[PDB]
RNA sequence: UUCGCAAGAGUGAAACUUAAAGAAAUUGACGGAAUGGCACCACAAGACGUGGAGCGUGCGGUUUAAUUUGACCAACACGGGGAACUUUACCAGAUCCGGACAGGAUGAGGAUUGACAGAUUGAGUGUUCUUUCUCGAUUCCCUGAAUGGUGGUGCAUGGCCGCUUAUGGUCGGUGGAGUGAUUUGUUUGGUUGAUUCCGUCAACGGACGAGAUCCAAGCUGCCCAGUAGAAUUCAGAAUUGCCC
RNA sequence: AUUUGCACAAGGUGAAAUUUUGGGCAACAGCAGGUCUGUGAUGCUCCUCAAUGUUCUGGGCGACACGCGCACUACAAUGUCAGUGAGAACAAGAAAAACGACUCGAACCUACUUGAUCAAAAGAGUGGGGAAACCCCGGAAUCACAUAGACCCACUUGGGACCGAGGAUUGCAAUUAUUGGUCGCGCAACGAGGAAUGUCUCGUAGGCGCAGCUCAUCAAACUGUGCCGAUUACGUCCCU
């Protein structure tokens, strides 16, 4: 018998169209890309309410 | 019912119950039955002990959430088992899939992986949530079947080990004897630790075991040493005679 | 003792005199002996995604009124301390398809020196060794000492169990003391052990250490090794 109730699994989630909504005919990129030279172009900085976060290298830059 | 003084004797069922009971031989095993041998896991002559104390360790019991379990001469400093974590098989919790593959959903208008921060938490563990980034077709979702397991069953097994069993034991072939199971060979005698030999003989011929082989140790030969040593020369240095 | 044969007993010879000594191997039949906790040995069966798989954290395997088997230490003067001497043998020792340099270094063992113008245990350097090469002339302790040393028959300078404080070391982690070292405790029993019971015949018993093994750390275990070394019998079938 168990009294912690069960954990899920944990399931990604998705946005259907995230690529669209880092960039903005001109174009500029909404995301800050990250500093660090092995994550180099294509890997953009988390724009959360509190700070910016790196998927790859983990950087994270408080606000 | 007859006989008897009586004890009883003669005569003599059935109901019911039961698959054997018996008989003679054979091989084992056993004997508080004989004979001959042998062993310090036996004794004799003894020696050191153990059993008494403290402590180490193993076993049991008790306790515990768990105190994981095997083993009870041939279990108990034994599982090479002197476990802080691991080991670990037990207990309280928490991760991962190390469920390949196949079939069917979703699926690059994204199947999925991993995460900073703040909460959850034992965890400055993305284990889960909020949050979005990240990786891209490796996974994920469902059914089947696979996988792994110090899960069971050693009374399903292999292999190995222990023990019977440290003694001298064991088996065919052909021949003899019995209806046969079986027996002789494999033996009365002496000898040997020895079914070891010598003799004897319904046997003869063999095969294992014992012995032999093997490994060390004691004596010794050859060979050999800038990874062993020795002796002898010079050269240096030390003691040096009255001392009690 | 002997018809013979097979042999035996003493003594010679000899390093060795009867399976030389000690081991290893060891038949045929078996046992419902043990091992499914060695294996990618294995049949059947059980669990299999909040798992009996696997990993991680923490506990336990060590718990203690007790019983039992094995071992260690003792009960002291054939002694305990303190000092000095002479003196063994088996043995072990370091690393990669990884880490740094660029094939070599470090892991392992050990010697020497310092620490040290002041305890031990430490900590540090400098070398050496792949092991007949370094350790190492392997300074083991039982032992010895005419050491003109202390103790003097007492639970006592026997015994060293229990427990308290300091400090060091191994490890990622030492609390349930990991293990050494220091000062205390010693007033904990134990003064030779009932009934029973183990092993042993010569370099043996007994006593004494040392190495390997388990091992990052830890031996009262085991496997070996050497040292000091006897009493007794060399017989029997009374017991098993
Ligand atoms: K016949
Ligand atoms: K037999
Ligand atoms: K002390
Ligand atoms: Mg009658
Ligand atoms: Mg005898
Ligand atoms: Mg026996
Ligand atoms: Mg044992
Ligand atoms: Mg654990
Ligand atoms: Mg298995
Ligand atoms: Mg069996
Ligand atoms: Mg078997
Ligand atoms: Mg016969
Ligand atoms: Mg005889
Ligand atoms: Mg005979
Ligand atoms: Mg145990
Ligand atoms: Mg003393
Ligand atoms: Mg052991
Ligand atoms: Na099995």
Redesign the pocket.
């Known amino acids: 018998i168990?009294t912690?109730?069960?954990?899920?699994?944990?399931?990604?989630?998705?946005?259907?169209?995230?690529?669209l909504?880092?960039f903005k005919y001109k174009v500029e990129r909404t995301?800050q890309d990250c500093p660090h030279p092995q994550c180099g172009a294509?890997?953009?900085?988390?724009?959360?309410?509190?700070?910016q976060?790196?998927?790859?290298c983990?950087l994270?830059y408080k606000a």
């Open positions: 168990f912690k109730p069960k954990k899920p699994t944990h399931r990604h989630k998705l946005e259907k169209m995230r690529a909504k880092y995301r294509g890997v953009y900085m988390a724009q959360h309410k509190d700070r976060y790196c998927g790859k983990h994270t």
